[model samples]
Target chain A: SLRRGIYHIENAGVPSAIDLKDGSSSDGTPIVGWQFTPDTINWHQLWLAEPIPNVADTFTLCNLFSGTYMDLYNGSSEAGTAVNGWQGTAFTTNPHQLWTIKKSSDGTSYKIQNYGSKTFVDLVNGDSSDGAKIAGWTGTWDEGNPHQKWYFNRMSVSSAEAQAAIARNPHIHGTYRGYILDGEYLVLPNATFTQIWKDSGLPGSKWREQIYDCDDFAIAMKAAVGKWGADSWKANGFAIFCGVMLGVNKAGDAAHAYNFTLTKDHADIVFFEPQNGGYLNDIGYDSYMAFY
Target chain B: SLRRGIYHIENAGVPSAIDLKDGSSSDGTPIVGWQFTPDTINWHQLWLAEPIPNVADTFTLCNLFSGTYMDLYNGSSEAGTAVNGWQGTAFTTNPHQLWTIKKSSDGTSYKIQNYGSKTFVDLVNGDSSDGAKIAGWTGTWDEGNPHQKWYFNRMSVSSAEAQAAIARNPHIHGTYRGYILDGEYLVLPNATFTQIWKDSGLPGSKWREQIYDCDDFAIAMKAAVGKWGADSWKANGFAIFCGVMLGVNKAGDAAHAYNFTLTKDHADIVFFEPQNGGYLNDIGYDSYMAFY
Candidate 1:
């Protein structure tokens, strides 16, 4: 089923509890990215600042991260009306969230509902690219399997191995990149890696982004700051920016990133049906998409 | 018998081995000012960038970080001198290896010597004041008495303590500070108070600096950077710039500070002078320094 290239961890070097490009944590520490589980009671929206292009082939490739199953929910305020379904092994082109896929055997008249929470409030219908509100609802499971899983591919090797390699090739492991899937379907922006973890970092292990690197991510994230920075830029400001700086960057170890949710709809979405069509061309060709 | 007070330490945060000022460890490592022994050779210079000034109450102090006195040799082709009969003590700023001192035996010839190279050049006739040349002579014996014995009085705590005290009031077990004996006798700038042997038997006591009620040393360091922005300039073009990040504060341990030394002139002085009033003052008073 899988090749023998070290499954789940390709290069290894993304720090645990890492701060995403938008300064959010994968852990449940602050307002950045909250911890989500398969059986979450209500609907919660995890956001990514990088934009997943609005395409289909991007989804068939299945983004190779660490998580499995990204369920979709309806855009509703009421609880039971939310339609929860999983996003198959694919990376969505836009930023969205996982809502509860309600199943009650009563297959008829099942409609997807949207919960009007701060998480996914705008995107359900209001059209917020990055900070769109994800509304949970009770709706028909329009999506099939393989539509719910997300993957975070490792970027570098363990510190010891990286160090050893660095001893031989000074500029090798430094090129390894880690990133956060931002926008509607968690898009990714390249993150510079560093050996900043006070804790001895392991090789093929967890990695961290130095603050300067984080600053670089901040700059790279400028594409989101304006239409020029992030792929999408309607929601100008981030509501929250929680970040984590984990000690190690290997698997089985837990660390943190940043948590950032832009609450204010400061400006209009910089992204739109562009004057020309090819803008989304190369972007789609070079990005990961979620499969349905 | 000495009174107790807080001393300041120089290096403590991010990149445990980075210089608080230059963000590089090329400068000599931070030193311990108060815990220096006066009559024995238990210390050696680690990293020095500029020439040191020689005078009364001015001397260089070093602790056997890794190797022995035999390992302390002048490897540089230009730097030639041998050190002998060196004595060290606790809380004393006596000459450790390379320093100019007023001879306790004859008080006539000021000696300059480099233990690394084993050369003793003598400056002979001089008094203790600022800009005194450190010279060497026919190696003399320090009979372990008051005449041959020297002590560091009014030793300041290390800079780490000062950094901490600058924040709140944490422990000063490991800090950096300068030692100016008797308010103006001798001086060791940016020296740290370090732990001799950790969890061992032989003289394993620890030393720390104590400053005013400061917050975390990192915060204070950052505040100083904000007020000064002195190092911020180096980030642009220099290879080694001042690091403002939180963790990297000192050179290696919390007790050490990054140091740099320069030998200005070559003469027959018994001991090598640390060299320069401006250099000392710059390191002693400036909150943080930067190199371009």
Candidate 2:
């Protein structure tokens, strides 16, 4: 089963992963393969795998940065049709956006195929360059096709771990979910933040597009943690704050807002979905922050 | 014995009290008596008493705002010299700045007199105007002189109460004494603040002049409480903050700084000596603060 969560789709044989070129959010930007960097956020490679409704083992890989889906060029099912970016409905009305990620014979990687077809997402000509494009190509796992193999990396700490952390830090918490992030931020210890996230009950709230949405959840997490920390670590002045990467959220719009509180505990930051407390891995971004 | 602490000097019989003219800190400013007000802090009227060594029973009354000593013009021993403000040495070498506050025959108030003279602090011509000047005059308790009777009302809570409150709230405390007051403030509850003040160990520090002195003590109480609240009540976002009332501290500088945290629990704000846990009383003054 293709798990439903964020991932950095890495090519199995080559040292490259799919990325939105130049971190651009505009439509039609070429979805190219970049060198797979480890232990660091690639910024442009993260994709959220959401299982399409009423379809078994089929999903839509939404680009975390552009908040767009990997769509076949001109919605064509032809072999060698280019895969560009497109902001479309999450529903499976368009087969061009639907994909099936199933276990390959190699077992460690996956063969990502276009829904209702034998064509797989192939690294164009198996080009191994930074900006190499991806397109639909006929391939089968029995041949051990490396360009068609992919891997989905988990992005955040598991909820069970966060919940366990909450049990460890039962001493501090907050009740509200909004605060002014105008300026002045201090990041909490990673585990402590994890505890606070579980304690916030933010993961329980459903994500909506109009209100109680992605950005709200993002702000809510920061605010909830900030409000909590404003109470908890307040004496010590610890809070969660930093800059933002160029990406849209899950709200399915031209613009998106997720939450990011860069923690010193990890080499990479925790860019998570405030709506569900999902830690976005290799979160596919760059941003800087300053303080007094 | 004259207790060396900040006090609101009230005139006996009449409703008026000794208040610094216009809350002025300028030297030579007239020391006039004004209608005594209750509850709120009387900013200009608070005086810090310090005993002059080698001159038992005599002390210097320093205005908290101007940080100036109560001096007789020209250091005169004359029967009708005017009392003016001067930033003088805290020693007894300047007899004009030295005063004796002893129990009047009536136990309610004292007879404030000039050092080395029978001349007492008299209400000029028995005039009870708002700007009536205080002067040196010869009078005796046997003469039933109401003009010279005064009361030294304490300005802060006792250290014992603060110590006890610390026992009540041992869960929260801070170890630091500095923060940005550039803007933004929040006030803590009276009793809780009392505990934090004691818990801060600020009351235990000795007062010095040029460094680690009065204002530092003031900022220390605010910051310690703020830092503690920043941690303890951080989850709840409660803090202690308010404005200043004019007056000098025991450091004997021409300018002074003490802490005033206007609390909602009492009709009067506690204008206190952060150097020691002393809550000022009858310190009539008012100030405004805002937050978003």
Candidate 3:
């Protein structure tokens, strides 16, 4: 039962979890159905799936990140009705926020419907891409409808506990080096990164002090990727600040630096040693990651 | 049961499917345990998981794209012996590519082992990110180990049928817009694209033919994303050629231009109408797409 737990609602077929877009706390921020990233586990994706009082298996889901109800846009009974964090708990009788979730023939998954239009919340336009908007759609809601059939990857922690687990300022503010950076940083999948790392020749260089020390090596790696996506960044005005995270070592007081990123296809912070083609252990952001 | 299956091997915890990295057919091109994309189904990721003619429960896995065996690198027993398509089917006596299969405690998944070292096949470093290398690792192999515990998202078709289903080049040859592109295009997740699109003001512009016609509109949207990841693409020789796919319409007489992409986290291609932000249906690649 959805009421049996706090949930991380996800879809098995398309393979994505429901996320509050970019961890925004703003009202009307989109509710996105994107690929599951551990990054959102605490900050934006947890939901309190509560059964509405006196309703027959109907539920009201409130996002922990923004404290908003998952409401349909204007409560319209139309297809592609935008779904977002517009309604609050204060709206006691808004059927736009109430949902009827019933089990699908798939045994473990369920279909969620609006109490008003009975339209299903789907990845808008059947998009399985991350950052896809979750919108109300008029469809035959069932297991056969992969996007409509949903399941919860149940969670044991509260919103505060999960969000608190984020040890740093979870926002990705791209680094400013006091000069023009042509692009915002974007993620490349591990394979892509590995390919880039080899091509960047960072691993082939010998480490030297001042001319090419730890931070410089990190900077070079960052620059290589930073330069690659310049146009994309310039167009958007924010480039990837995801590389060359500098901070104290786990040993305390020893300043060390290396390349770091949340691989484009991952939620976990991955550390890479620029001097060698090696993977770094999971270094905490607070202790080891100081993004400029 | 392993013999009865033609499989698209996958990991449930990290949710990535096995792919023959970037659909390359060259020997030793590295087997990537990356996120599942419908793109790799026929061309690269599909495997013929055939039970060995004699050995107890062992199987020889051959990639459909490259008729190579899923061989252990140099047949080493080390913790991280690289796994790839190194051997061929003619080597019947070779144990390097043979694997032991068994169901995990989780009933639905299995643990694959090496006939030589008994080391389990795993996503190297237990990394779930796409393009992660698959390697042999000595561990307590069981379903409890997320990366070690594997399952077949069983398929019913052969490789030829799948590769044929591709119906197009199946290669991403980024268009040469000629001079000043600065970097190769990179994929921005759909949500990231949505955020960038709103900020790009492509939606707010009034349509002016020739000044900003269909292809120009598509190019601007592509340029916005392409420029954003310029550094990443520039660092590597190739950049994304995944936008402004141009070709004739399904109507046969009309030549139409629109924007297209396989978003960073998706295998299915997406068509976007830039004049007004609308999603296009699954337009076949061969019939509708032509890239330079």
Candidate 4:
């Protein structure tokens, strides 16, 4: 049996998105028609087909993008009116979005029929030409219109699993540093540096110059984490830092950089040496200036 | 058995039109993302999926709208290039358009792969959102991705059957009549008249007028045939005429009207009485005017 999860409904062969026809998500903006988009990149195309509470076999297809449900137009009982996504605070247990998914006998397909209209979700005359209108139609099962058939593919990820996947990648900790340029220097946006890092196959080795120093490695570490910032870096409790070290190493002032992240218990911060790709407990270096 | 016919490929619940992006038929137009429209109403949305000549288990999808075949870009062995339709006089047995239909074991689905590229027609990430890009991807069989799965639906109509359906309607031969409104006259366009005839419910009964004439009936017959002009009137060896009859009836020196059509054999034209819905070979009324 297919378990409850976030899944994408593939009709025709592409994933169907609850499209805002005018590309606007305002009230009264008509949900024009269903579109076939490549993959599930946004929440609108991904649906949480959760079973209705206490309603056996019925589910509400909530759009993760818009936080709406696949609602029929005004709960219309007639055909031709477009089915749209209605913004609701939560699943209202209404008929408009509630549906009964009847799996094909062979278990390879399903027919999602709206509970309110009692019409099968039809691909408007079986038009396989993409962008063809999707509508509800009065048709009996076993008529064998493939347009009414759907294939369910889940695109859901558990929160813990997602966090663990990011945290387990051991490239975040390292020692980093660089020399201070005599004049004003432009530090490239971490985005560009991230692209460069990815293009270099995510090189673990820090960029070291004979003249430039450890702060450069801090920037490199910064770029690496920035590559997957909101997705993994910050979400996994890792933090980056760049600053000047107070103690003189070569009888001259030298800048140092590193990363700080939370331990397993979030009790204390762990210092990372990005330049040497090592961890430090307390290296007698005072932070004069800091940047992430 | 899909058989050789017009078909549409729908993915992820929407019809997948082999759409020419930007609505251009010129070379390098690029087959952009597939759109979901309301049925196959345009050439870009219609495809003739016919068996490839002399090739068993293979088919060439020809566009009835563009008269082009879905071709792979440069016959490339790489992915990422957009698949497009190439303009040609007819279905060329090129590898781009020729595809082997690998039906799923369930017999309810199929995977269409380009013969040249050996890449499956993918909906580019199983996207079912609108304007989703449809392209070719390198993937092996049994790796389930809904983007590669397609449903073949037929929208074919044969010339012989279409003609027969029209010819069998006996209303082709009818008696018609109308009055001359003297100075101002409204001659309805064939399209307008066709709508009127349909609005009148395709009356089988002949028109009855107190002072008018048979030409009105002729106009009615003209409208009826014109309603289905593109399909039956021209293809079934039938032509409708609406004009004045030279001779007067009871009104003395008054103009008369009726309808006449060519015989199926084209041997001679036969007069029709639209009011009475009957055919007459020679009624001693000379043709003085004509309108289709």
Candidate 5:
């Protein structure tokens, strides 16, 4: 029997904003970025038939491409730094360094910390669409862009409709489409497209939706993000903030995602399907449909 | 790591006896006399596809042959009074009566103290080979004889060879040659050649093979009479007890029908092949093998 009572469930709002800086990209978008924890960027987590257990730590700080950069660290010190657009091969033996997103307005002079004894590989100035190579390199004060720049994060769907999408393509994994709600950080197709926000005792910088136009797509994405976010964080912007309280975020970004409100009954008729199947390489949005 | 231990298991014995108790030239054997509970004859414990629930407090009692006698109660002061069998229609009812067997020279007569109301049905005895009609009638007693009796005990076989012996036609169920060792009773092919030992706890009554000097045929008849007393029971004693265990008692007799057992290997193998197809009534025993 269900318990009879006026059970009070506190309300939550969509992620208003995240405090993260960006890193590497396939097409020059921010790669590694950070907010805090509950929210993050979309990353396609793929495991090779065999994996190098801790590749990031092995390279220390490395740089790849011309604009993107990677600096792995332990905090307060340069861990290993790599700038994109470098020309030669160099080797460094550091396993404890990691590159991170720092709170920087000017991308050129940012601080990156390291925890290892060596440096990162520099693989830069290589042509796009062609597999470029990387090798260990020493770090410098923003050396003119070394190669080997990369970022990592969790996968994201941000909607319940997007969460349930099944994949027919043998190549695209359902987990990569962000349904792998294994409660890890959100990583998109690539780290450059990913974003994140830490908890701030409020609906901070996390993936959110605009409720005014809430459709199956927004609903599913919010559901996915909400599940990955901590309980202290809010879920779908449609119900928690927009539908339930009808509140709006100061920054319009949060409102951009929440197009409608989700009632308990409304949730029953929604599903998410990823469009990665046979899709062109860069198409971003996850597809969805309404089901009763 | 694999576990270490040697395991040995015994196979299930096949149903050795089968009787319709119809008193037919084909396959009907009557069940006239039974030693009451404790001294009660065993019909193999049935591995019913569905078990008979509520087997407690009572069970069906039927007489298989054309004969009448008294239900001598030791405590009722009405010792040796008849249960009224001479009229000859089949009858049965499970008495809540608890019967205790007390032995003087033999353990045949039992003290049936009435725990509840019980009526003995003169089993509708048809003397043709098809066996008795199955139903219940008023309780009665008439002269009890060999043609109208039965006894059941579990058949015994120790090895695959012994199980094969059990599967041979005469020893196999339909031919009435072999008998299956149920938990306690030896189920027969038919009641025609089979007989109940008038006493319990006697060496000869305990189902051990006592080979007679003559061939298997002569030894077979002597086997039945030896088990159940010759004075107490006798068959037509012609050449074929092989086909005789299926005889029925007169109009008011009752007898158990046939059910068989097979070696686990044979059972498993047969159950997998063209199949015993039990629903189709295709059982495993080969009559040709038994008769030959």
Candidate 6:
């Protein structure tokens, strides 16, 4: 079954979030080519796959932000006719938007073939650069072309796994739910520590926008883990661990908010800039402030 | 001994952080009257009281942000002279900045009298308005002026009480220092569910910022409790408790992210907008998503 959650559509060998060109076009705009962006939080970059009833391995790509669905241009069956997004409700049985999933030789990837256009989704100009366009092309198979393949990265934990974690760490768990992407997970916030410091002077200043600050960022991530649960809380499944890191920065001052996380395991810890989505190998600040 | 930690100085009669005027004035600028802000987080609003060497009941009020010391302007012994903040090191002993503490009728309040000026620090115009200024005034006593009286609210837990709570809940305590008002505690992240939704659309959006959204806010508060420990972690101390809340807003939709905390005791469960600082008697959300 197609996972009902948020996913990043990569151009096979070229990994990127298959993004909407400039977020959107007009309401009834013709299908142009789609573009790619680096790992991002853009709603346009996320494709929501809702399983279609009475069909085997078929689903519609819906945009959580726009309430639109990816569709074939003018329902044209010809090759090279660009793919675009539109209000899926306007047309029933949107064969153009309906994609039949076909797993690739490498089980991790899948090919999405349009039932209406009968063409495979391909990258325009065969470009691998960011913002490279995507369109339909002839032939179901490409000679080592990575653009046609897709990957599904689960962001939610199953209900059973969530329950188990709650039982294991009752102090850490709250309200359990099978990890699923909804409007709540579709968007997140970004802030920096310096920005928070500047705004701290004002009475009743907007603090969440300034959450990019280190401490606040840690707090935010902690909240997200509890709220969203790890991608999979099972020991074998994907999990996220968060805690405070007390250490020095370049100047060697007593820095309190320096923190790290373990997405897969504890052996290799990844340090992150909570303000921005950047990661570092080792900041030389392995000092732990307080971990839970 | 007067507590050596961060504090919020309020008028004994009225509770408010006796904030520094915009954090500071030009070096050696005559001390104008200071102002008051309600439940503020401004560093100027925060005064760090450090004990004077070998001196009983005497402390230097330092600005947490500017690194400036509170001083008496020009060493003026005259009544109604302006007091100020400066880099106290130029003088051998900043007598102007040295404040002699006098306990008030109520044990919780005190009178801050200048050792050099022999005048009591008073609010100008006896104004209690949120930004009303303060200054040095004639006479060490004012019969009815509440502005002349002050209270120091400590930000950390008492050492004796912190130890007690640790024993009660070792699973909850960390390298626990009595709560100190650092930049992180002074300015907390305030993101709301809706705001998080909007911002979450951006690529690689700061998930922490997204905490105002339903799940992240819970995770954030949980992490905070584990890291800093709440003001009232013990049965007697002021602690913060967080958990998931499930209820509907005005629309009656199945709503999540509505969280609440106990400022002093469980009898007064105050619901709050996690994205911002707003308190409510009851938001009509009684269902629980999870609690810790």
Sorted by TM-score (best first), the order is 6, 2, 4, 3, 1, 5
Better of 1 and 3 by lDDT: 3
Candidate RMSDs in order:
21.3, 18.9, 26.2, 36.0, 30.2, 10.7
Q: What is the lDDT of residue A18 in candidate 2?
A: 89
Identify the runs in model 4 with alpha carbons over 4 angstroms from their true place: A1-292, B13-17, B39-43, B141-143, B159-292
Q: What lDDT is reached at residue B287 by model 5?
A: 23
Worst 10 residues of 3 chain B by lDDT: B174-183
Question: What class would a CAPRI assessor give candidate 4's docking?
Answer: incorrect
Computed on C-alphas against the true complex, the DockQ of each candidate is 0.04, 0.02, 0.01, 0.00, 0.01, 0.12
The CAPRI-style docking tier of model 3 reads incorrect
Chain A TM-score relative to the true structure, per candidate: 0.19, 0.58, 0.51, 0.51, 0.25, 0.56
**Per-prediction TM-score, chain B alone:** 0.23, 0.58, 0.51, 0.53, 0.22, 0.56
Better of 1 and 3 by DockQ: 1
Residue-level lDDT of model 4, residues A1-292, one tens digit each, is 4445556577644445434443334434444336554432432455556666676667776554454666776666676656676665334667877777767644577777788888877666655553567677776656566767777665433323223332443332222112111111112233333343455322454232211124334433543443322221111111121222212223334434554433333223345565544556565544432222
Candidate with more favorable, higher DockQ: 2 or 5 = 2
lDDT of each: 0.21, 0.57, 0.57, 0.48, 0.23, 0.49
Cα displacement (angstroms), candidate 1, residue B198, comes to 28
DockQ of 4: 0.00
Model 2, position B94, has a per-residue lDDT of 76
Question: Which 10-residue window of candidate 2 chain B scores lowest in summed lDDT?
Answer: B175-184
Q: Per-residue lDDT of B22-43 in model 3, one digit per residue for the tens? A: 5555567788777665423234
- TM per prediction: 0.24, 0.41, 0.28, 0.30, 0.18, 0.53
Candidate 6 overall lDDT versus native: 0.49
Residue runs of model 3 more than 4 Å from their true location after superposition: A1-292, B38-42, B141-143, B157-292
Name the 10 consecutive residues with the lowest summed lDDT in model 4 chain B.
Answer: B176-185
Residue-level lDDT of model 1, residues B164-276, one tens digit each, is 33233121112222111111101122221111111111122111111100111221222222222212211210011111111122442222122221111111101111111
Error of 6 at B10 (Å): 7.0
Q: Write the per-residue lDDT of candidate 6 for residues B74-190, one digit (tens) a residue.
A: 667666666666775312267888877766655557788777777777766666667665677765443455667887766433334333433343122223332212222221223
Cα deviation of A198 in candidate 6 (Å)? 16
